[PDB]
Amino acid sequence: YGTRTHGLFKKLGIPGPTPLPFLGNALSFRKGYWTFDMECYKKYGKVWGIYDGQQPMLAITDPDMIKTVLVKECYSVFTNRRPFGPVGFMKNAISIAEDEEWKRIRSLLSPTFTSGKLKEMVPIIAQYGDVLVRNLRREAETGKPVTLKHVFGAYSMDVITSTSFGVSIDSLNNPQDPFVENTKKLLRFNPLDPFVLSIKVFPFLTPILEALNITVFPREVISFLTKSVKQIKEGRLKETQKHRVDFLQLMIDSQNSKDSETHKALSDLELMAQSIIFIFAGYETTSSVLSFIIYELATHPDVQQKVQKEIDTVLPNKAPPTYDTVLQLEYLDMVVNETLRLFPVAMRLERVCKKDVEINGMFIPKGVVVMIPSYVLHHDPKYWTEPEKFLPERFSAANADNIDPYIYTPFGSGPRNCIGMRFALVNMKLALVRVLQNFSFKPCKETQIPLKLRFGGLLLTEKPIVLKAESRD
Numbered sequence: 001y002g003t004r005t006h007g008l009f010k011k012l013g014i015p016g017p018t019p020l021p022f023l024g025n026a027l028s029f030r031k032g033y034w035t036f037d038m039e040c041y042k043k044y045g046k047v048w049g050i051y052d053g054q055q056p057m058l059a060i061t062d063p064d065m066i067k068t069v070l071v072k073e074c075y076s077v078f079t080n081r082r083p084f085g086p087v088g089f090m091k092n093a094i095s096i097a098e099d100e101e102w103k104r105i106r107s108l109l110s111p112t113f114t115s116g117k118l119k120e121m122v123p124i125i126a127q128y129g130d131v132l133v134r135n136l137r138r139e140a141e142t143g144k145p146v147t148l149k150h151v152f153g154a155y156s157m158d159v160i161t162s163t164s165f166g167v168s169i170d171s172l173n174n175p176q177d178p179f180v181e182n183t184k185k186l187l188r189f190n191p192l193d194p195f196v197l198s199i200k201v202f203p204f205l206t207p208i209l210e211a212l213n214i215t216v217f218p219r220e221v222i223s224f225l226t227k228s229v230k231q232i233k234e235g236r237l238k239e240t241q242k243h244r245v246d247f248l249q250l251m252i253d254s255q256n257s258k259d260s261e262t263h264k265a266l267s268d269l270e271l272m273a274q275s276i277i278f279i280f281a282g283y284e285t286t287s288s289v290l291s292f293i294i295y296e297l298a299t300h301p302d303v304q305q306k307v308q309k310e311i312d313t314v315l316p317n318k319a320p321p322t323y324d325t326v327l328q329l330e331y332l333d334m335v336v337n338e339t340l341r342l343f344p345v346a347m348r349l350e351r352v353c354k355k356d357v358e359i360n361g362m363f364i365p366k367g368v369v370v371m372i373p374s375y376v377l378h379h380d381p382k383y384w385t386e387p388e389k390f391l392p393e394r395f396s397a398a399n400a401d402n403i404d405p406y407i408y409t410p411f412g413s414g415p416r417n418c419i420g421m422r423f424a425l426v427n428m429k430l431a432l433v434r435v436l437q438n439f440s441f442k443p444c445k446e447t448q449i450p451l452k453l454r455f456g457g458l459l460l461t462e463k464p465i466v467l468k469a470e471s472r473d
């Protein structure tokens with residue numbers, strides 16, 4: 001079994017590194033997905049193939065092929081992400097459901113993710129900006145370098161947990177709160193657990209374990225959150241009077257009243273899957289991107305200044321940020337967009353080939369995972385002049401046509417792209433405005449001079465990011 005599918009690419013004429021029995025190329029990943037992909041591209045070129053366990057993955061880099069995979073042949077061939085072992089009911093989570101199941105869950109969640117529903121929700125999020133400034137002021141007034149991830153992670157979990165589960169929390173000033181402890185326990189599951197790496201090697205074990213309700217997610221944590229959420233929904237029915245606008249409230253409203261009577265409404269179970277998956281998807285991505293943004297700003301003090309000026313122009317005298325004012329921070333959007341070009345935390349987009357296909361003159365067999373190396377295409381001199389430089393003007397209104405949405409894909413693209421993109425961008429800007437309104441960041445002795453990535457599911461750093469924050473007056 002261990003060296004079965006390993007002659008697949010060589011029969012297809014596709015270059016790639018030579019796999020090992022059982023593990024495929026998995027070991028060569030431990031240097032970092034961003035590095036491995038880069039190396040393969042310079043060596044094998046336009047297209048290469050690799051093996052993760054027994055799973056063949058065909059990395060492609062032509063935008064025309066990428067566009068075909070992510071948009072046109074999305075519903076028909078390239079609809080699903082890889083499985084990663086025995087889930088349980090989490091099969092209903094939007095990012096794990098497949099095919100039609102997925103197409104319905106996405107359709108049901110789309111109303112809950114409208115921009116107008118996002119604008120309604122911002123004022124509940126603002127309060128967690130109050131807390132970020134507190135947490136940061138306490139660390140900074142000590143004249144002791146700040147660990148970005150300490151406070152931004154606190155902000156990330158604070159927002160995403162609160163709004164997904166309907167309860168306010170403060171993971172830093174109240175970690176005893178069972179929701180903080182339990183959610184942290186949940187967010188410790190990650191695709192690089194040994195149990196997953198072993199299921200990746202022997203995928204045929206999954207059916208059996210799902211026959212035995214042996215799931216890859218924490219059994220007990222999820223039983224807690226589920227009951228804790230149940231009580232919320234019910235203690236929420238009795239208090240008619242109050243109008244909630246968090247993610248929980250919009251998904252309950254969607255349960256009653258069927259718009260688009262094509263689909264049956266969400267069950268209570270499917271609804272838990274969404275709230276849990278929102279956190280997995282929102283927590284660490286946001287925490288990382290905010291950290292990388294502050295870092296870029298610290299090592300580019302003139303950019304930091306332009307951001308601060310625009311903030312002060314659009315929000316005079318530390319005016320509180322709102323949905324409609326965040327929407328005016330044109331230069332801040334460019335800063336964010338440029339930080340995601342250098343630091344696409346996902347690193348890769350992945351899609352499963354449902355059937356034999358030929359796309360843009362290339363045959364792809366059923367069962368292969370088409371992989372788009374977003375990190376590679378983001379740093380490619382072929383599409384980006386001077387690509388390792390932070391230059392937010394790249395994303396100016398004037399260079400809009402110079403930007404291919406199938407090269408730059410920090411939120412993926414197409415029908416299965418990040419459903420929370422707009423939320424993530426608003427939320428990150430609420431944080432950035434509140435922080436930069438009060439503080440400025442500069443390097444310190446500790447700050448790791450050029451930044452160094454580390455192996456992980458997301459883009460992580462070797463050493464944490466330490467900066468000093470100096471109060472503004």
Ligand code: HEM
Pocket residue numbers: 094095096106160277278279281282283285286289345346349350409410411412413414415416417418419420421423424
């Ligand atoms: C900076 C923050 C974030 C980044 C960089 C990010 C990035 C991504 C990427 C690259 C994908 C894959 C898209 C594809 O394969 O084409 C994705 C999927 C997804 N994201 Fe995020 N994300 C962020 C925040 C969030 C937040 C806050 C939420 C929820 C509120 C969220 C919810 C989702 C969901 C549900 C999916 C799965 C979509 C599906 O399978 O239908 N993300 N995200």
Ligand SMILES: C[C@]12CC[C@H](OS(=O)(=O)O)CC1=CC[C@@H]1[C@@H]2CC[C@]2(C)C(=O)CC[C@@H]12
Pocket residue numbers: 001002003202
């Ligand atoms: C996983 C392994 C051993 C490695 C074989 O790979 S192979 O190249 O020797 O065919 C495939 C394989 C198949 C079934 C697996 C076996 C390992 C022992 C297993 C898991 C049990 O207790 C019951 C099922 C057995």
Ligand SMILES: C[C@]12CC[C@H](OS(=O)(=O)O)CC1=CC[C@@H]1[C@@H]2CC[C@]2(C)C(=O)CC[C@@H]12
Pocket residue numbers: 212213214
């Ligand atoms: C894990 C599962 C079946 C699912 C049960 O969950 S439950 O909600 O039905 O109680 C818990 C559970 C308990 C004992 C577990 C069993 C799976 C099979 C196990 C692991 C063995 O070979 C010996 C111990 C057995």
